[PDB]
């Protein structure tokens, strides 16, 4: 004791003595809940009334800790906060509070008699504060608070910082915690009833603030201004004030960056490369400057006067453009605590899914032809937004009807019913050939599906129905055909690199550009019944040309028809497509129905249909490009010029880029604004010269401003938390990687992610049998430390807890995380690893590196050092991994790496599309199962989308305590492995022996090290930082490589690098080695493109001869964002002594050695060139195997 006095705290290295100390102090916090109370709330802490220091840019700031009385002494629960209607059929129309209100946690009690109106209500509000407030990603909400504060102790080497006083002033009541969460009951259980009801969400808010200090956004002085705003924002309702302020508070950067005037920024080309830098003036146009007056008057009224005085400070004291970036990162973390927003779904139902009328009323088209029911068949607009929208979309009708004829729609629908056989044709013949089918789907209600999201209200999305989706299936099929005929929308696969934003880094660098970005997220309410009729005129004009003989239950037949100008019914030949599209438009019931435990069944108003599914994402995609591009044709008809360059319809955004004179670009950008008004949408574009705004990204002058408040480490939407360590530790590597370029100090995310896995993810519990219990504890204690529990006579098994050896976080096949320097026997330390280190099989080098390698090359020994690794606890950590006790991870869960994509329009269309491929790969897997070779479900192509459809549709409890049973079998394995155990080396580890000696020659930097030195490309890379200098050495990123992997990801759906351990290979080689004629049936089952069939069929011939030789590593695309993906980029940074060209012909392998060592050492790299030093046993291993066996992916 204590953490801030530890040897690790001062040297930030792992010696033999300082690793055990930090391994002990985290074992005491992860276990005892007495030691955690005494860690956070300890009396030695001296409170801070007033504090002084520097803000994000270095200017000095003075703040004061002020906690309001209304949080400390809450009001008693007032039933008028959540009023009902007179008939008590729903919450009152106007009502202020959609979320918790701040009241004394004991003031809420239901004394009413059961099964009354008010009893059900107070049962739900009691369920609101006790249940909905529980969201935690890793461990108990208190263990997530220690991990944040424990890292701040170690980082700053003090216990005195302002964030720790809030923790003591708020959550310290008596000698126990005010509240705690019980996983059995899935609730928060209040000890002190006098505590405020909203504090359970301030445990998560102190975590997201404490994450912002370690992240390097906020300082300790800005931590006060941030936490005083949150405490201010909670009265009466905490989340209701954030949502009201959130826009006001973040929009000042436009004005602050106007006063900066000139700024020098990089210049990008089309091709994702930096071609130079440029000095531009950031002064905004007059029509932008006029909006700064209305915002000053608004920010003054609404904002907390201490936080408003911080914004007024960032507009003045900002000097260059980087200074504006550093304040906008802080002002964004002051308005957002990162938690997912939750209510009772019938409190938030009003303001979300309830339709609204805005601007102008849309009007009907003239009906040129109609059904005998007077249902419209073909129709046309007189003038208005309709005619503008059609003057564009009507040019695609005869191109689409060609493509809608080529499809087979009955076979298209079987592929939907099957992938989400002769059995299924009896179903389709019974269900869908009857006219009664149309009747069943009109009578069916529409359920209300909601999905939570951070810093925004709960969002209503539409799930997949069998009956309701069948009415709109035919318009969807016709509608999605435009995606191939246009550039106007991004449905493509997302790379995750800067390749994704690479097209808006080009236009922010261009000259004479006006940049419009509209937020369309709230549109689906603004759509009315008459607004959808702009899309129907597009579909009914395509369906009149399309001829499909049958789409059940519709036939092509001569139908009586009325026309305009003819007084009697005509007769036309009306095909089954334009019977099916005409009935979908004429019968429209939009309104969803949610069934509430309080009010029974609640039904929404008729207007608004949510945007979730692929079918109504095309409705919103086609309608917008129809209005915005069709307006461009209307201008040329008026004699006016058209300056619009491009349009991208993203999921929640519309991004227009105009280029021209300031007079033209404004007059055109205004008329596109009035045409979305005349169509009934109330929206305001953000017009900006040098900045363009989207979700989770901000691109300003060819740079990138990442939003780090949208990656929530400490909370989840699912609350699927279980005892699964492998899936959890993999989920943490996905988040930490996702913050690397959104954060100003990645060296702080490594210490914060270490105390998460040290405290939160540490302990693991298994259930031994009664007879084997004392035999297990005796064998494992030689390596792992354990805690025994009393034996219960009422059961046949006993629980016992296992706290992991701390080195398990760093081990290759277990959890794997960037290491701190360990200490060799020599006294020298291994290199401190960066966030750029490559996971996977590359992590086994840490064993040979601590061994060390430099002594192994000289002594010509391949023998690992068993004595040290046992002292740091690597042996017990590798033994734990060998036993396979921890929970397995599917290949399907791996398919979600959890980068958050830029456009969600492709997330929608991915659900219902590409059916013929997911069917053909379904035929293959079954027909192959019959032949005697069965494939695991995770490998088959369409199975990833099938599980997420069915599994989310179950309400069965997923909450079960995770306890693994040690039976006679596994206990038999424990005794074996734990006796003689010494770490197991494989022959392929000879590739892990190589060393780099630092030479005296400095290396030429790339010419774009200069262009990126003025205004930085991202928060983590600024001039001199670790992300900049690595970008100066290895220039990113390879365009023709990222185009190649997105052509492969366009079949399999996702890209994963080849490996001989990949379960796709393993089972593929079983077929190859036994029955070769089934490979064609195997390659369709997994839908490998013609390129991957070559990579496999070669590796089968290498794996037959040589076994498993490859040198494997994992670098995520989100991890390396601007940096290069191609190892050849390091060819110039290392010299190879010429005597290795004679013996070994593998040059491209020495580049992967050089590439991974340079990314790993960049924190320590001063710019000198290296020299490769190879082990004699490495050379002799490489020249007994062809290089193609080591690098099967690459083409030599």
């Amino acid at each position: 004791t204590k953490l801030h006095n530890t040897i690790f705290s001062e040297t930030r290295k792992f010696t033999r003595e300082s690793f055990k100390e930090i391994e002990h102090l985290t074992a005491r916090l992860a276990n005892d809940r007495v030691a955690r109370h005494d860690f956070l709330f300890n009396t030695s802490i001296v409170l801070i009334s007033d504090y002084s220091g520097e803000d994000s840019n270095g200017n000095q700031l003075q703040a004061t800790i002020t906690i309001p009385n209304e949080i400390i002494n809450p009001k008693e629960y007032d039933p008028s906060d959540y009023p009902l209607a007179e008939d008590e059929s729903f919450f009152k129309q106007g009502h202020k509070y959609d979320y918790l209100v701040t009241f004394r946690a004991g003031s809420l009690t239901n004394t009413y008699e059961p099964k009354t109106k008010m009893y059900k209500l107070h049962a739900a509000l009691d369920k609101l504060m006790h249940v909905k407030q529980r969201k935690s990603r890793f461990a108990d909400l208190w263990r997530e608070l220690c991990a944040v504060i424990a890292s701040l102790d170690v980082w700053y080497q003090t216990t005195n910082y302002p964030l720790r006083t809030y923790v003591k002033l708020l959550f310290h009541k008596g000698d126990e915690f005010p509240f705690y969460e019980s996983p059995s009951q899935d609730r928060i259980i209040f000890n002190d009833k006098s505590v405020a009801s909203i504090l359970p969400t301030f445990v998560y808010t102190c975590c997201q603030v404490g994450t912002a200090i370690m992240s390097g956004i906020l300082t300790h002085v800005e931590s006060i201004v941030a936490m005083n705003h949150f405490l201010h924002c909670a009265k009466d309702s905490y989340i209701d004030e954030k949502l009201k302020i959130k826009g006001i508070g973040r929009s000042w950067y436009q004005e602050a960056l106007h006063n900066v005037c000139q700024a020098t920024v990089p210049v990008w080309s089309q091709f994702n490369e930096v071609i130079g830098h440029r000095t531009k003036s950031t002064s905004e146009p007059h029509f932008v400057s006029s909006t700064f007056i209305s915002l000053r008057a608004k920010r003054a009224e609404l904002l907390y006067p201490e936080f408003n005085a911080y914004i007024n400070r960032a507009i003045q004291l900002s000097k260059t453009q980087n200074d504006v970036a550093n304040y906008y990162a802080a002002c964004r973390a002051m308005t957002n605590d990162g938690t997912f927003l939750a209510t009772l779904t019938e409190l938030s139902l009003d303001a979300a899914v309830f339709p609204r009328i805005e601007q102008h009323l849309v009007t009907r088209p003239a009906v040129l032809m109609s059904n005998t029911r007077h249902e419209s068949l073909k129709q046309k607009y007189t003038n208005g937004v309709g005619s503008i929208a059609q003057s564009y979309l009507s040019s695609f009708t005869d191109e689409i009807a060609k493509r809608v004829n080529g499809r087979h729609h009955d076979e298209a629908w079987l592929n939907f019913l099957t992938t989400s056989r002769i059995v299924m044709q009896a179903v389709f013949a019974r269900e869908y050939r009857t006219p009664e089918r149309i009747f069943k789907s009109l009578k069916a209600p529409i359920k209300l599906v909601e999905r939570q999201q951070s810093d925004r209200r709960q969002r209503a999305i539409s799930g997949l129905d069998n009956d309701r989706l069948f009415l709109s299936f035919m318009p969807y099929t016709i509608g999605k055909q435009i995606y191939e005929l246009n550039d106007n929308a991004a449905q493509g696969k997302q790379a995750g690199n800067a390749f994704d934003i690479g097209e808006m880094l080009y236009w922010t660098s261009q000259r004479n550009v006006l940049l419009s970005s509209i937020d369309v997220a709230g549109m689906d309410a603004s759509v009315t019944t008459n607004t959808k009729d702009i899309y129907n005129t597009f579909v009914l004009d395509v369906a009149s040309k399309c001829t499909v003989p049958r789409f059940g239950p519709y036939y092509a037949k001569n139908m009586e028809v009325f026309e305009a100008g003819n007084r009697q019914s005509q007769v036309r030949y009306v095909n089954a497509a334009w019977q099916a599209c005409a009935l979908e438009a004429a019968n429209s019931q939009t309104s969803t129905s949610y069934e509430s435990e309080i009010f029974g069944q609640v039904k929404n108003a008729e207007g608004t249909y949510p945007s979730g599914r692929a079918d109504t994402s095309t409705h919103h995609t086609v309608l917008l490009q129809g209005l915005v591009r069709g307006n461009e044709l209307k201008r040329a008809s008026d004699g006016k010029n058209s300056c619009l360059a491009t349009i991208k319809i993203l999921g929640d955004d519309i991004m227009e880029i105009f280029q021209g004179s300031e007079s033209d670009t404004y007059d055109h950008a205004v008329s596109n604004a009035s045409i979305l008004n005349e169509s009934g949408f109330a929206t305001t574009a953000e017009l900006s010269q040098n900045s363009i705004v989207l979700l989770q990204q901000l691109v300003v002058n060819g740079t990138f401003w990442g939003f780090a408040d949208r990656i929530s480490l400490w909370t989840r939407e699912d609350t699927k938390d279980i005892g699964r360590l492998n899936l959890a530790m993999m989920e943490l590597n996905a988040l930490i990687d996702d913050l690397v370029f959104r954060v100003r100090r990645p060296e702080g995310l490594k210490m914060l992610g270490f105390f998460c896995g040290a405290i939160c993810l540490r302990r693991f519990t298994l259930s031994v049998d009664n007879k084997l219990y004392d035999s297990t504890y005796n064998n494992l204690s030689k390596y792992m430390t354990l805690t025994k529990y009393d034996k219960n006579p009422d059961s046949d098994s006993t629980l016992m807890s296992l706290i992991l050896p701390l080195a398990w976080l760093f081990m290759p096949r277990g959890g794997e995380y960037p290491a701190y320097p360990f200490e060799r026997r020599d006294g020298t330390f291994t290199e401190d690893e960066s966030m750029f280190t490559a996971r996977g099989a590359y992590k086994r080098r840490l064993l040979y590196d601590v061994s060390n390698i430099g002594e192994m090359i000289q002594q010509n020994s391949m023998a690992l050092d068993d004595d040290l690794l046992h002292e740091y606890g690597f042996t017990g950590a590798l033994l734990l991994i060998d036993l396979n006790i921890l929970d397995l991870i599917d290949e399907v869960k791996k398919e979600d790496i959890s980068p958050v994509k830029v456009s969600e329009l492709a997330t929608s269309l991915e659900q219902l599309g590409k059916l013929g491929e997911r069917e053909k790969s379904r035929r293959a897997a079954s027909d192959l199962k019959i032949r005697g070779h069965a494939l695991s479900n995770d490998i088959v192509y369409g199975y990833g989308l099938q599980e997420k459809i069915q599994k989310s549709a179950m309400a069965t409890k997923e909450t079960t305590v995770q306890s693994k049973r040690v039976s006679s079998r596994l206990h038999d394995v424990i005794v074996a492995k734990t006796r003689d155990y010494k770490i197991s080396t494989i022959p392929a580890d000879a590739l892990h022996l190589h060393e780099f000696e630092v030479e005296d020659v400095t290396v030429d930097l790339l010419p774009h090290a200069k262009h990126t030195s003025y205004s930085s490309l991202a928060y983590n890379m600024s001039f001199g930082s670790d992300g900049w200098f690595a970008f100066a050495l290895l220039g990113g990123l390879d365009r023709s490589a990222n185009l190649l992997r997105l052509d492969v990801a366009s079949i399999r759906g996702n890209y994963h690098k080849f490996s001989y351990d990949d379960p796709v290979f393993k089972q593929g080689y079983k077929i190859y080695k036994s029955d070769a004629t089934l490979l064609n049936d195997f390659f369709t089952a997994i839908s490998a493109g013609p390129k991957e069939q070559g990579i496999l069929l070669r590796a089968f011939a290498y794996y037959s001869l040589y076994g498993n030789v490859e040198y494997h590593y994992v670098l995520s695309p989100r991890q390396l964002f601007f940096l290069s993906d191609n190892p050849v980029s390091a060819e110039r940074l290392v010299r190879i002594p010429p005597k290795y060209y004679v013996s070994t012909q593998c040059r491209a392998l020495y580049n992967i050695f050089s590439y991974l060592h340079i990314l790993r050492s960049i924190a320590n790299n001063r710019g000198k060139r290296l020299k490769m030093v190879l082990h004699p046993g490495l050379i002799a291993y490489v020249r007994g195997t062809s290089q193609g066996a080591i690098l099967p992916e690459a083409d030599n």
Partner: peptide
């Protein structure tokens, strides 16, 4: 020398 200082010095000399 701190690493940043060395990095800055290296940068300046090449680009004088």
């Amino acid at each position: 020398p701190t690493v940043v200082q060395s990095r800055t010095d290296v940068f300046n000399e090449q680009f004088a």
